[PDB]
UniProtKB/Swiss-Prot annotation, chain C:
Places the protein is found: Cytoplasm; Nucleus
Gene name as annotated: PSMA3
Protein family membership: Belongs to the peptidase T1A family.
Protein known as: Proteasome subunit alpha type-3
Keywords: Acetylation, Cytoplasm, Host-virus interaction, Nucleus, Phosphoprotein, Proteasome
Organism: Homo sapiens
Induction section of the entry: Down-regulated by antioxidants BO-653 and probucol. Up-regulated by bacterial lipopolysaccharides (LPS) and TNF.
Curated annotation (Swiss-Prot), chain E:
Modified residues (Phosphoserine): S12, S74, S172
Organism: Homo sapiens
Record's subunit section: The 26S proteasome consists of a 20S proteasome core and two 19S regulatory subunits. The 20S proteasome core is a barrel-shaped complex made of 28 subunits that are arranged in four stacked rings. The two outer rings are each formed by seven alpha subunits, and the two inner rings are formed by seven beta subunits. The proteolytic activity is exerted by three beta-subunits PSMB5, PSMB6 and PSMB7.
PROSITE patterns linked to this entry: PROTEASOME_ALPHA_1, PROTEASOME_ALPHA_2
Entry-linked Pfam families: Proteasome, Proteasome_A_N
A cellular-component GO term for this protein: proteasome complex
Protein name: Proteasome subunit alpha type-4
Predominant location category: cytoplasm
Curated annotation (Swiss-Prot), chain F:
GO cellular component, one term: proteasome complex
Keyword line: Acetylation, Cytoplasm, Host-virus interaction, Nucleus, Proteasome
Name of the protein: Proteasome subunit beta type-3
Family membership: Belongs to the peptidase T1B family.
Superkingdom in the source lineage: Eukaryota
Pfam families: Proteasome
Residues recorded with modification N-acetylserine: S1
PROSITE patterns: PROTEASOME_BETA_1, PROTEASOME_BETA_2
InterPro entries: Ntn_hydrolases_N (IPR029055), Proteasome_beta_3 (IPR033811), Proteasome_bsu_CS (IPR016050), Proteasome_sua/b (IPR001353), Proteasome_suB-type (IPR023333)
Inducing stimuli: Up-regulated in asthenozoospermic sperm.
Organism: Homo sapiens (Human)
High-level lineage: Eukaryota, Metazoa, Chordata, Craniata, Vertebrata
Assembly notes: The 26S proteasome consists of a 20S proteasome core and two 19S regulatory subunits. The 20S proteasome core is a barrel-shaped complex made of 28 subunits that are arranged in four stacked rings. The two outer rings are each formed by seven alpha subunits, and the two inner rings are formed by seven beta subunits. The proteolytic activity is exerted by three beta-subunits PSMB5, PSMB6 and PSMB7. (Microbial infection) Interacts with HIV-1 TAT protein.
SUPFAM superfamilies for this protein: N-terminal nucleophile aminohydrolases (Ntn hydrolases) (SSF56235)
Curated annotation (Swiss-Prot), chain G:
Name of the molecule in the record: Proteasome subunit alpha type-7
Induction line: Down-regulated by the ribozyme Rz3'X. Up-regulated in colorectal cancer tissues.
Residues bearing attached sugar chains per UniProt: S129
Annotated function: Component of the 20S core proteasome complex involved in the proteolytic degradation of most intracellular proteins. This complex plays numerous essential roles within the cell by associating with different regulatory particles. Associated with two 19S regulatory particles, forms the 26S proteasome and thus participates in the ATP-dependent degradation of ubiquitinated proteins.
Major subcellular site: cytoplasm
Keyword Protein biosynthesis applies: no
Disulfide bonding pattern of the chain: none
GO CC annotation terms, alphabetical: cytoplasm; cytosol; extracellular exosome; nucleoplasm; nucleus; proteasome complex; proteasome core complex; proteasome core complex, alpha-subunit complex
Record PANTHER family: PROTEASOME SUBUNIT ALPHA/BETA
Modifications the protein undergoes after translation, according to the UniProt entry: Phosphorylation by ABL1 or ABL2 leads to an inhibition of proteasomal activity and cell cycle transition blocks.
UniProt xrefs under InterPro entries: Ntn_hydrolases_N, Proteasome_alpha, Proteasome_alpha-type, Proteasome_asu_N, Proteasome_sua/b
Family from the record: Belongs to the peptidase T1A family.
Length: 220, 232, 240, 234, 250, 204, 238, 243
């Protein structure tokens, strides 16, 4: 519930948390909040995870069809406009708030998309429940035309702040860098949180539990 | 728009779909193409004979991909090929959306066959005037499918559609091996294409696609002419 | 057969004989002429008097399709009425969707597209009517577009549709209509229509004449009666 | 095939409707007589074999308590129109608390008639015209009434009409023996004798269906005993 | 459209239906299909015509498909019609399975298919499906049971029947050499080999020219087994041996 | 609360290369128990089980429709279902009712048909894919089950220790829950067999 | 979308499509129906016995309810769909009336279906003539015959299909009131009527009988054999 | 003299015995029925469409009979065949281009527009209930990463990329002129391209056309909006080629 994106000197850097929770307890610590769309387009989704996943899948399929028909690389713009119109047709009932980053023929682009269908092209965007911490980090330590490592560190710090100041994000950070030339997608970018081992290991063997009936059906 | 509800394709007294036979005749009269299988991939080749060089032979493409792992070529009418490949792309995208896994080539060919059958048995339409050679890779295996305007399909290790297609088939049978490599498949395909080109093939006039475990990809004229030079 | 049965098929050469027969059906009808000048567009249409029991102004071949656009028709008059209804519907849609009166160029383009759209399917037949639309604007001037039953619309300094269309065109060529005065052009239209009318072929006849232009405050209207008699007298004198 | 369902003749009429009229004369013979004391309908059953039950062979149908109908032609096609007429009469009653007039029933039947085509309306519609001539006898506020419904939709109000296999000639003879001041008994006697004369086979109670509508009584169909009572004098 | 319609969904002056007649005639020269019933199973023999060496032949079966968990089908005629027919049959069989939580009876499924085929002949203006179907299956009510259906929409239940070329000769061979109620799987298989050898005498019995399928009921479970190429070779060898023995005894 | 209307508890964890999936057996209205032999784990393949939790009617309907489309797919395609494809297909099925969602949170467990690599995943009422290597749980017992698993689960477990762990997990997660329990059914899918067991749980 | 008028009036108002459907009915199999004073009997020639065939699936006599049954003559597939539609109509009537169905009403709505297919667009009528047997509420036997033209008429006895006219003309002269008093005489009459049609006489024939609301059953092959023997016994003495 | 026909093979677009579509191939000569020839060429950085302007009568406003249509700002087009069909195809192309612009956020590439129009034409060819729009369109544009582009659809629908082509009565003669010109010269600048475009029409049709007797459109990479040459430019190019 903490995703962010930024444009640096070359292209786009996207980052996301991993604490996918339903209700109030953590349901997963390895959510894939940075969806692939095109070899030059990624999008980070927040909100209803099923809706975000279906939206990203539909957009990826539509841009696959478009790019393969036109013989050109997909455009962040054609993705942003499709997302806008599709969400506006459903009047925001698709609980998906998206950060669409990519690199196209006209240059790197970053867009913020709201579930009602509103979109905006901004150099740095944050989204999700923990969006405010990352937004503050960006407002504090953002510069125009930053280097690759500077952008990576800035996004990492923003995700760390969102993780540590929100109760719906954590347990990992995912990064994806798109440029005019290279696309990197490093999921376990940095694991700022570890787990101590169980000090007293408690194991059981057969005969510790009571079973009523056994039914073996060997397969081949 | 009203739409005719009577099928233009009808059973002849002998039961033969003479309209489908005429469609296959149009396929034969169209530009020839060949497809061949290797032990680890599929190669599709075809010739694009335009008019005089005023046509930008580079601008237009004949070999077309459906997915990253499926490509195809046609023998027949380009107008039908465009709509057919567009619909096949839509079907593959819909399957990927539904099942979050790449389309199997067999299932894609089955869907294309169903579409062709719907065209042939429906009203107000014309049967498609193309024969599709479809290359695909999935589960670490190659697949090459013949699809006819009649709507049927087959898994063919080698095939040749168009003019002199029976002789191309015989030549492929003679020059086909069970355990050949992709290099041998390319040699055989280019050999058949030059044996049935009728007019001194060129790298621009030959367009080839290769499908293997790395996906489907169309060879650019550079390595195209490289292989023509290596094959003589 | 097979090449002249429907509008959805070509002749072995690639012709549309149904549209050619529509052209015949619009040619054999009564004459209808439209002359645009620098300060107006006039229409004079020839009315066949089947019997004197009819009213003057009955079965008008002149329709008023927009607040400023007229329509002089020839061919099947029921078809012409239907096309005038379609034209005024299109004008109403444009006015509703854009807040102002439709320009004649786009009006004619849309109507011709509609006419051509009913020349593609075997489920319909091409219109048996040709029609000239004249309009005026403060920024555009006087405009006149003629439209064929096939669906082709062109701007005409002066056009004629019907039997004596070519004769009307040729004798009116002496007029430099592109910079003439609408009032006197009305009288010259009366003249040309009287000469091109064949009294022996049609002993009984009537004239419906109208204009639209700057003198109309840019709204389509019929000729006032007094100008009607004066133009009739001029035409009688020109008959010699 | 080739010719459509909406095709006229060179002289300007539907040869499909002409064929329907021909099928009308191919139909069974029926007679209807309207008098000042009611109206009577009769029809020849045309029994094919004695095994066929006379009960299921009835060309006279009740539209309402005051309306009877005689059908000639495609008797299978006539029952759908009869059902429509009855439901329309009952709708009129449900709407206006009164029995539907016979003339309005006939007009509505005409509205249903000649409504068919290939692609002219909803696909679930008629393809061919009704091939049945009808005689609507009834009693309403205008006294006894009798209407000849032509499959053409040219409904007629007629005092007496004979239709079917022996329509013409028999109708002229019935007119000659018909008067403007006949009683109901005279009307039934005349209709019965004309039908007996025009019968193609030796008729009896099992060869004819008879019904009447009276100003006082409802629509009553003559059973066998009264049929024999009225036919023994003729 | 009156002149240019094909009007394939109307009657004929003599009362026949030319479209279904032509479909049956095309099926006659189409491939060979045979179905037979045994006391412990039902067997299918399908003949494949296009046998070019360029075939990948990776499929388990070409004209034999599996309609549902406990029923198999053999198609005769247009394979493209066969594919859409087969997946429609699978769809409706699974529909019955969903609706009743019970395997769909073979008679039920055949009646449904014949209903849809009859309606498609009845109207729609389209050329009928010129494919004959031969269904085998097992059910709670009748167990092993096989039907032959026609493009006209008519079906029949048989102990054994064949479609394709020399259909009359094949059915005569069945009527002569089928032991009703006493046909084991082995003797049924031998009769099937005999028919495959005889009803298509041109291009005498070949392993790759035909495909063989069996349907049995083991432990309350319907098992559909496609005999492999080595199995078909074993059948050919057994047929040759038995024919040689019969001729030598003759 | 609609998913707690009938109650439910399903879990699945991975072994060394085997899988364990377990479920409660109690079926009843919010208040009274009707049946204690209800089946909540259904085979979508020879080496692939699926557990469903939530509204009982939606469980049954979703299972029926899933088996429908799965059987159609496998008959059309000729291969046993791949677990990832099954999970994606059921997720799509749930998403098809975005405005009419089935109040069910399912889990899918099994082995790769050719690799036998353990696979487990979870969904929600909309059908959100959730693939987690260690374990996935669903039902009204969610908190108890998560707490149990996040300390009882270890990587690379033999089938017997896997069964013991999942059995203890279900027993000790349902004995502290009121709308679930009354018997636990456990399926252990090993490389070459499956073992179905009923635990000796408290029936009340 | 398919709405081409198939059934149109030919010259002289003759429905040539109806005539062709009648031709198909005539070319179809032979069936007969008798309405005895106590029972109703249907007899169908199982022509082309074609051994190794499960005749259960081809049985042309099908029961619609506990008191209604029908035997067709014509197209087997159209007969099957009409039987399905008649099952639908009988069940719908039973639901909406909670009373036993009526034979005449069933036949009437089937006739209305046939007439709708004659009057419909893009459709052809059902090339089958149906003999509907049944019993009313009071146990009154009912025998009706409907034709593809849509006309249905009640008959004491009749025949449809191949040889229908010859059989019905034989039955109109062989039919007497005292000849249908008991099931034995009714069965013998039907068997001797169909004997002139079927060459085998006993094995290419099938008989069904319905009593007054007594769960109609199909006649046993042994009963058919012994009754053909009985009619031969009558023949030798007469 | 026994003008027999083979049923409906020669009457509606159904498969002929020779594997041909008769009503599709009639469209090729339906193009010729228009009696007008339109020839388009592309330079290294420019594309020029040159089309003779027919004036059958002075009595019509010849200033309003211009047959060059701007599909978008940067896409111009010209058609041959039925003029009503040409107007309909121009309207459809404008609709599709605008729809692409809205649905995809950037101007439609000319190749994709031609592909869409060709698919729409294949719709007519496939269906047996519509006239297959016997009109040919040729469109121009300026494309990033690929340069100036000219495409041409057809009632049959088989389109292709090309340096130069023509549609009309003398399209074959224009094709021959293009063959000889490409075999003679290769390097083309803007003025050489426009001079060759004028030379094609002049050599092929041999009219010595007046300045008002043609209509010419150009797309250049200085203001990629499609712009139509007026009388001044027409006369300038005419005298430049003459000298």
């Amino acid at each position: 519930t903490t995703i962010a994106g930024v444009v640096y000197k070359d292209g786009i850097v996207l980052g996301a948390d991993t604490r996918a929770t339903e209700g109030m307890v953590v349901a997963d610590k390895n959510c894939s909040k940075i969806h692939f769309i095109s070899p030059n387009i990624y999008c980070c989704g927040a909100g209803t995870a099923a809706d975000t996943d279906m939206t990203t899948q539909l957009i990826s399929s539509n841009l696959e069809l478009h790019s393969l028909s036109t013989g050109r690389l997909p455009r962040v713009v054609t993705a942003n406009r499709m997302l806008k119109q599709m969400l506006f047709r459903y009047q925001g009932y698709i609980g998906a708030a998206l950060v669409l980053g990519g690199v196209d023929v006209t240059g790197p682009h970053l867009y913020s998309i709201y579930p009602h269908g509103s979109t905006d092209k901004l150099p740095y965007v944050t989204m999700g429940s923990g969006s405010l911490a990352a937004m503050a980090v960006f407002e504090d330590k953002f510069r125009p035309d930053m280097e690759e490592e500077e952008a990576k560190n800035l996004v990492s710090e923003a995700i760390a702040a969102g993780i540590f100041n929100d109760l719906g994000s954590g347990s990992n950070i995912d990064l994806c860098v798109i440029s005019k030339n290279k696309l990197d997608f490093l999921r376990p970018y940095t694991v700022p949180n570890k787990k101590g081992t169980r000090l007293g290991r408690y194991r059981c063997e057969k005969g510790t539990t009571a079973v009523l009936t056994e039914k073996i059906t060997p397969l081949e | 728009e009203r739409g005719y509800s009577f099928s233009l394709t009808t059973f002849s007294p002998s039961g033969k779909l003479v309209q489908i036979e005429y469609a296959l005749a149009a396929v034969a009269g169209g530009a020839p193409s060949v497809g061949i299988k290797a032990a680890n991939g599929v190669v599709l080749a075809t010739e694009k004979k335009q008019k005089s060089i005023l046509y930008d032979e580079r601008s237009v493409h004949k070999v077309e991909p459906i997915t990253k792992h499926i490509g195809l070529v046609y023998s027949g009418m380009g107008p039908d090929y465009r709509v057919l490949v567009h619909r096949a792309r839509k079907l593959a995208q819909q399957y990927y959306l539904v099942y979050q896994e790449p389309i199997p080539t067999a299932q894609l060919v089955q869907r294309v066959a169903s579409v062709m059958q719907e065209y042939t048995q429906s009203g107000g339409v014309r049967p498609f005037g193309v024969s599709l050679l479809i290359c695909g890779w999935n589960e670490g295996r190659p697949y090459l499918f013949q699809s006819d305007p009649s709507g049927a399909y087959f898994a063919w290790k080698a095939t040749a559609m168009g003019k002199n297609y029976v002789n191309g088939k015989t030549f492929l049978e003679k020059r086909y091996n069970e355990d050949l490599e992709l290099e041998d498949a390319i040699h055989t395909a280019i050999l058949t294409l030059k044996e049935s080109f009728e007019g001194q093939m060129t790298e621009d006039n030959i367009e080839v696609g290769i499908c293997n475990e790395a996906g489907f990809r169309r060879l650019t004229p550079t390595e195209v002419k490289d292989y023509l030079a290596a094959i003589a | 057969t097979g090449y002249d049965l429907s509008a959805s098929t070509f002749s072995p050469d690639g012709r549309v004989f149904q549209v050619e027969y529509a052209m015949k059906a619009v040619e054999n009808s009564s004459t209808a002429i439209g002359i645009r000048c620098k300060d107006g567009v006039v229409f004079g249409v020839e009315k066949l008097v089947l019997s004197k029991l009819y009213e003057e102004g009955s079965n008008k071949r002149l329709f008023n399709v927009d607040r400023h656009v007229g329509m002089a028709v020839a061919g099947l008059l029921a078809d012409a009425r239907s096309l005038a209804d379609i034209a005024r519907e299109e004008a109403s849609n444009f006015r509703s969707n854009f807040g102002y009166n439709i320009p004649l160029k786009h009006l004619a383009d849309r109507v011709a597209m509609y006419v051509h759209a009913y020349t593609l399917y075997s489920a319909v037949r091409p219109f048996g009517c040709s029609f000239m639309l004249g309009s005026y604007s403060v920024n555009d001037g006087a405009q006149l577009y003629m439209i064929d039953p096939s669906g082709v619309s062109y701007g005409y300094w002066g056009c004629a549709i019907g039997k004596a269309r070519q004769a009307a065109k040729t004798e009116i060529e002496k007029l430099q209509m592109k910079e003439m005065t609408c009032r006197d052009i009305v009288k010259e239209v009366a003249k040309i229509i009287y000469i091109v009318h064949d009294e022996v072929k049609d002993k009984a006849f009537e004239l419906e004449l109208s204009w639209v232009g700057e003198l109309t405050n840019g709204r389509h209207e019929i000729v006032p009666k007094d100008i009607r008699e004066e133009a009739e007298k001029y035409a009688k004198e020109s008959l010699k | 095939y080739d010719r459509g369902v909406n095709t006229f003749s060179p002289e300007g009429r539907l040869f499909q409707v002409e064929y329907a009229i021909e099928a009308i004369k191919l139909g069974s013979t029926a007679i209807g007589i309207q008098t000042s004391e009611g109206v009577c309908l009769a029809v020849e059953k045309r029994i094919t074999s004695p095994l066929m039950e006379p009960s299921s062979i009835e060309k006279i149908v009740e539209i309402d308590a005051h309306i009877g109908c005689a059908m000639s032609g495609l008797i299978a096609d006539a029952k759908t129109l009869i059902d429509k007429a009855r439901v329309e009469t009952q709708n009129h009653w449900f709407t206006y608390n009164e029995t539907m007039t016979v003339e309005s029933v006939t007009q509505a039947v005409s509205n249903l008639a000649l409504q068919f085509g290939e692609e002219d309306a909803d696909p679930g519609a008629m393809s061919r015209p009704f091939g049945v001539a009808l005689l609507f006898g009834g009693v309403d506020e205008k006294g006894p009434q009798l209407f000849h419904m032509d499959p053409s939709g040219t409904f007629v109000q007629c005092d007496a009409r004979a239709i079917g296999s022996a329509s013409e000639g028999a109708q002229s003879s019935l007119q000659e023996v018909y008067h403007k001041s006949m009683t109901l008994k005279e009307a039934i006697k005349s209709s019965l004798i004309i039908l007996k004369q025009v019968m193609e086979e030796k008729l009896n109670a099992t060869n004819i269906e008879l019904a009447t509508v009276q100003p006082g009584q409802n629509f009553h169909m003559f059973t066998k005993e009264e049929l024999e009572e009225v036919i023994k004098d003729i | 459209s009156r002149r240019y319609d094909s009007r394939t969904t109307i009657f004929s002056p003599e009362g026949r239906l030319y479209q279904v007649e032509y479909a049956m005639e095309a099926i006659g020269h189409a491939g060979t299909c045979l179905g037979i019933l045994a006391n412990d199973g039902v067997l299918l023999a399908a003949e494949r015509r296009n046998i070019h060496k360029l075939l990948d032949e990776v499929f388990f079966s070409e004209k034999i498909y599996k309609l549902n968990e406990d029923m198999a089908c053999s198609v005769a005629g247009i394979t493209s019609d066969a594919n859409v027919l087969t997946n429609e049959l699978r769809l409706i069989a699974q529909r019955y399975l969903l609706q009743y939580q019970e395997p769909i009876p073979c008679e039920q499924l055949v009646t449904a298919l014949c209903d849809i085929k009859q309606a498609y002949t009845q109207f729609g203006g389209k050329r009928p499906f010129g494919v004959s179907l031969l269904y085998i299956g097992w059910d709670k009510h009748y167990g092993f049971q096989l039907y032959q259906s026609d493009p006209s929409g008519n079906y029949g239940g048989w102990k054994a029947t064949c479609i394709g070329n020399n259909s009359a000769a094949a059915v005569s061979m069945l009527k002569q050499d089928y032991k009703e109620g006493e046909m084991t799987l082995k003797s049924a298989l031998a009769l099937a080999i005999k028919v495959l050898n005889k009803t298509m005498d041109v291009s005498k019995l070949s392993a790759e020219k035909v495909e063989i399928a069996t349907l049995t009921r083991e432990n309350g479970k319907t098992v559909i087994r496609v005999l492999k190429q080595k199995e078909v070779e074993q059948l050919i060898k057994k047929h040759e041996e038995e024919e040689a023995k019969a001729e030598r005894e003759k | 609360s609609i998913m707690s209307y009938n109650g439910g508890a399903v879990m699945a964890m991975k072994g060394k290369n085997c899988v364990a999936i377990a479920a409660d057996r109690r079926f009843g209205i919010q208040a009274q128990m009707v049946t204690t032999d209800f089946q909540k784990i259904f085979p979508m393949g020879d080496r692939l089980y699926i557990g469903l939790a939530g509204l009982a009617t939606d469980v049954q309907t979703v299972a029926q429709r899933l088996k429908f489309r799965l059987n159609l797919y496998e008959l059309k395609e000729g291969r046993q279902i791949k677990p990832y494809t099954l999970m994606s297909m059921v997720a799509n099925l749930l998403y098809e009712k975005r405005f009419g969602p089935y109040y069910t949170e399912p889990v899918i467990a099994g082995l790769d048909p050719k690799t036998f690599k353990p696979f487990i995943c979870s969904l929600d009422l909309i059908g959100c894919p959730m693939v987690t290597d260690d374990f996935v749980v669903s039902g009204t017992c969610a908190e108890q089950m998560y707490g149990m698993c996040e300390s009882l689960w270890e990587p690379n477990m033999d089938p017997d220790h896997l069964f013991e762990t999942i059995s203890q997990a279900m027993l000790n997660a349902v004995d502290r829950d009121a709308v679930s329990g009354m018997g636990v059914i456990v399926h252990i899918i090993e490389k070459d067999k499956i073992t179905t067991r009923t635990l000796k749980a408290r029936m009340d | 979308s398919y709405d081409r008028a198939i059934t149109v009036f030919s010259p002289d108002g003759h429905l040539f499509q109806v005539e062709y459907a009648q031709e198909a009915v005539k070319k179809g199999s032979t069936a007969v129906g008798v309405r005895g004073r106590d029972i109703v009997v249907l007899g169908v020639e199982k022509k082309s016995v074609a051994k190794l065939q499960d005749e259960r699936t081809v049985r042309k006599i099908c029961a619609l309810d506990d008191n209604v049954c029908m035997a067709f003559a014509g197209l087997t597939a159209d007969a099957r769909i009409v039987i399905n539609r008649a099952r639908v109509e009988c069940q719908s009537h039973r639901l909406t009336v909670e009373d036993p169905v009526t034979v005449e009403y069933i036949t009437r709505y089937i006739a209305s279906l046939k007439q709708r297919y004659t009057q419909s667009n893009g459709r052809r009528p059902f090339g089958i003539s149906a003999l509907i047997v049944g019993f009313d509420f009071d146990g009154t036997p009912r025998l009706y015959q409907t034709d593809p033209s849509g006309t249905y008429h009640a008959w004491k006895a009749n025949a449809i299909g191949r040889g229908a006219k010859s059989v019905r003309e034989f039955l109109e002269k062989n039919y007497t009131d005292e000849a249908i008093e008991t099931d034995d005489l009714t069965i013998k009459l039907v068997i001797k009527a169909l004997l002139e049609v079927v060459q085998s006489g006993g094995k290419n024939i099938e008989l069904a009988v319905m009593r007054r609301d007594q769960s109609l059953k199909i006649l046993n092959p042994e009963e058919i054999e012994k009754y053909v023997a009985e009619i031969e016994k009558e023949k030798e003495e007469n | 003299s026994r003008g027999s026909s083979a049923g409906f093979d020669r009457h509606i677009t159904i498969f002929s015995p020779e594997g041909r579509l008769y009503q599709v191939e009639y469209a090729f000569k339906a193009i010729n029925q228009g009696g007008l020839t339109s020839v388009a060429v592309r330079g290294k950085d420019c594309a020029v469409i040159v089309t003779q302007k027919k004036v059958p009568d002075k009595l019509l406003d010849s200033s309003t009979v211009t047959h060059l249509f701007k599909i978008t700002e940067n896409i111009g087009c010209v058609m041959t065949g039925m003029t009503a069909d040409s107007r309909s195809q121009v309207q459809r192309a404008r609709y599709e281009a605008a729809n692409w612009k809205y649905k995809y956020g950037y101007e439609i590439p000319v190749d994709m527009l031609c592909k869409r129009i060709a698919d729409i034409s294949q719709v007519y060819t496939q269906n047996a209930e519509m006239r297959p729009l016997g009109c040919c369109m040729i469109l121009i544009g300026i494309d990033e990463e690929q340069g100036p582009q000219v495409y041409k659809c057809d009632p049959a629908g088989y389109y292709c990329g090309f340096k130069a082509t023509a549609a009309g009565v003398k399209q074959t003669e224009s094709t021959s002129f293009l063959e000889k010109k490409v075999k003679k010269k290769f390097d083309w600048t803007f003025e050489q391209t426009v001079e060759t475009a004028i030379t094609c029409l002049s050599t092929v049709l041999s009219i010595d056309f007046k300045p008002s007797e043609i209509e010419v459109g150009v797309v250049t990479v200085e203001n990629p909006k499609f712009r139509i040459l007026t009388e001044a430019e027409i006369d300038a190019h005419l005298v430049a080629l003459a000298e």
